[PDB]
């Protein structure tokens, strides 16, 4: 059923993805790398005291605070949803091998019984209405770029001046590049404007993953994570194999002489992709305006900030269903990419821009190093982009692609199982747009709050309510997928964007509250994804610029968890046992040092002004900018803090670009 073509790095098609400079050449050849991360300055993730601390703390918390999740997956009582063993990983050392990314997900979708297009004309109108409401009356804004971020293929530059020039030039030449692609001249568009080529695959650590303790044996068991070998990936699963990666860490002793305590494992690794920046720039120039529109006009459904901000909406509901989606990015459908492009053309968007967008969602992928002695292979032919990888993580609008797919998918699930009486309001495009516009503003008896693959579905009192309960019961039974589009189930311990929905004895939205997930506090403080990069002088370019600051926002973020105090005390006690020092004093010192370091980066902060003006969000973001790529957005951050982390291209240049893209 068509194996994707594959080319070794030595092949000219792969060589052309890397410019003639040392960084790009090194990225092309980089071999498998592993090693302990520097968890905090001077502390390695495999330090024997640190592991002893994690062993004691994870056992203690699990023993004293067993999960409180009912049969319907609602969290109550102590606010705990699983054991605390997820922290038992040797951070920096990956499971082996990581997966080869699937070149085509068509068979994966068909075999999971998911549809190859909108099932009914109503659904077709709703997906298209989503495109019309999201992309219509957009306002230009400057194109912001993360400081220190890479341009990936083909230059691999991390220099801000170079990145700004690449982006400006890309906005100037996107039209000529898109028209070349409309003529089938992808090699020309790539050679002349670097628009095309491939995504560059980097494997990221998912630092904590499930682990259970077998009461029978007293031995810990890590969750098996299935990975595809090369044959499987290039044949869409027709050949080759899907098998459990090895998380066994015993090897670290033999290989590096690192002591491995019982029940500690190698980390789960996930594929992540960096896009060719010249192609992404023109897409980001439209995506940000779209985010601004949906987070303002449709803030009810899409703009989520604090626990209370979420709580206000959910408290008004009579029923709240916390859904889960299996493997969202890999199952994301290429037919939606095509439906979206078709609808943008219908709205009058420039064809050359739609073509760039379409191409960014069919691009080849260059696999670097999934394991020792493996990799350095290009999947797909850049001369004619035709992959179906699902949704690429580094595409310039991935968050929006997942949000559009899922928001309509959940609305369809509510229509299908609970509100057939609303079907008559969706007769054609005009009526579909009116209905979706009202639904997204939270004005219908069926509602939702969502972001990509996380969501909570709601029902107020009314005719749909009774159906809502049957849908919830169908999810609980878990025998039939309620959607024809993606694999949907209910979340075990319902949460939304990091906050757990804590129910009381009534088990009703009206008396439930959103609280911080104490397990996420533990993940962030003791299993960060990256080391502190103490050798990177410019802190704003680090993955974790000011780790100490999170101590100042901790109470605000996690204080409402029922066992907040208990956890902080267990930490103090266990850290004393392991290090013979106070964890609280250690964090207070780090907070002081980082607060002083911060004033050097903030123009408005006096040589030692302090943190008085900063919000909890500001602090969480400065300690972990990653939260700005999955939890919050630019407007949620104080302006002077956003500037520490991001730089932009002039709105004058983007304003002119946008005028040439958008309809009349
Ligand atoms: Mn959730």
UniProtKB/Swiss-Prot annotation:
Pfam families: RdRP_1. One of its GO terms (cellular component) is virion component. Residues 309-484 form the RdRp catalytic domain. The keyword Nucleotide-binding applies. Mg(2+) binds at residues 453, 490, 494. One of its GO terms (biological process) is viral RNA genome replication. Its EC number is 2.7.7.48. It catalyses: RNA(n) + a ribonucleoside 5'-triphosphate = RNA(n+1) + diphosphate. Rna-dependent RNA polymerase part of the packaging complex that packages the viral RNA segments, replicate them into a double-stranded form and transcribe them. This is RNA-directed RNA polymerase.
């Amino acid at each position: 059923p068509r194996r994707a073509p594959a080319f070794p790095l030595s092949d000219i098609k792969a060589q052309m993805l890397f410019a003639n400079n040392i960084k790009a050449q090194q990225a092309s050849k980089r071999s498998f790398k592993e090693g302990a991360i520097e968890t905090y300055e001077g502390l390695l993730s495999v330090d024997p005291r640190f592991l002893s601390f994690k062993n004691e703390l994870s056992r203690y918390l699990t023993d004293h605070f067993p999960a409180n999740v009912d049969e319907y997956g609602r969290v109550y009582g102590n606010g705990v949803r699983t054991n605390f063993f997820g922290m038992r990983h040797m951070n920096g050392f990956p499971m082996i091998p990581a997966t080869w990314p699937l070149a085509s997900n068509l068979k994966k979708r068909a075999d999971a019984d998911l549809a190859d297009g909108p099932v009914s004309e109503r659904d077709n109108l709703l997906f298209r209405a989503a495109v019309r409401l999201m992309f219509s009356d957009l306002e230009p804004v400057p194109l912001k770029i993360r400081k220190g971020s890479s341009t990936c293929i083909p230059y691999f530059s991390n220099d801000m001046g170079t990145k700004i020039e690449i982006a400006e030039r890309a906005l100037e030449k996107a039209e000529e590049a898109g028209n070349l692609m409309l003529q089938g001249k992808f090699d020309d568009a790539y050679q002349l404007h670097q628009m095309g080529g491939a995504y560059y695959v980097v494997y990221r650590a998912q630092s904590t993953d499930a682990i259970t303790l077998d009461p029978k044996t007293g031995k810990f068991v890590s969750k098996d994570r299935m990975v595809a070998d090369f044959e499987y990936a290039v044949t869409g699963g027709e050949q080759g194999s899907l098998f459990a990666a090895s998380k066994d860490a015993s090897r670290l002793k033999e290989q590096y002489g690192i002591d491995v305590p019982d029940g500690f494992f190698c980390e789960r690794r996930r594929t992540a992709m960096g896009g060719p920046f010249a192609l992404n720039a023109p897409i980001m120039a439209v995506a940000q305006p779209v985010r601004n529109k949906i987070y303002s006009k449709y803030a009810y459904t899409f703009h989520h900030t604090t626990r209370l901000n979420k709580e206000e909406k959910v408290k008004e509901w009579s029923l709240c269903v916390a859904t889960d989606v299996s493997d969202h990015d890999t199952f994301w459908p290429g037919w939606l990419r095509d439906l979206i492009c078709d609808e943008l053309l219908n709205m009058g968007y420039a064809p050359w821009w739609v073509k760039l967008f379409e191409t960014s969602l069919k691009l080849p992928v260059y696999v670097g190093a999934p394991a020792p002695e493996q990799g350095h292979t290009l999947l797909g032919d850049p001369s004619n982009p035709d992959l179906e990888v699902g949704l690429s993580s580094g595409q310039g609008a991935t968050d929006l692609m997942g949000t559009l797919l899922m928001s309509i998918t959940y609305l369809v699930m509510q229509l299908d199982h609970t509100a057939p009486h609303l079907n008559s309001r969706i007769k054609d495009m005009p009526s579909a747009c009116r209905f979706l516009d009202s639904y997204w503003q939270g004005h219908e008896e069926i509602r939702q709050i969502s972001k990509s693959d996380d969501a909570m579905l709601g029902w107020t009192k009314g005719r749909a309510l009774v159906g809502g309960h049957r849908l919830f019961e169908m999810l609980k039974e878990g025998k039939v997928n309620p959607s024809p589009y993606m694999k949907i189930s209910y979340e075990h311990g319902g949460a939304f964007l990091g906050d757990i929905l804590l129910y009381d004895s009534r088990r009703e939205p009206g008396s439930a509250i959103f609280v911080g997930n104490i397990n996420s506090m533990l993940n962030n403080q003791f299993s960060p994804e990256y080391g502190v990069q103490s050798g990177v002088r410019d802190r704003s370019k680090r993955k974790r610029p000011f780790p100490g600051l999170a101590w100042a926002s901790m109470k605000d973020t996690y204080g409402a968890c029922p066992i907040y105090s208990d956890v902080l005390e267990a930490i103090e006690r266990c850290w004393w046992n392991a290090f013979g020092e106070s964890y609280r004093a250690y964090r207070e010192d780090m907070l002081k040092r980082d607060t002083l370091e911060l004033s050097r980066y903030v123009a408005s902060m006096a040589r030692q002004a302090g943190l008085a003006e900063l919000t909890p969000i500001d602090l969480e973001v400065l300690a972990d900018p990653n939260k700005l790529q999955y939890k919050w957005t630019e407007a949620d951050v104080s302006a002077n803090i956003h500037e520490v982390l991001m730089h932009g291209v002039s709105v004058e240049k983007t304003e002119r670009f946008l005028r040439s893209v958008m309809p009349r």
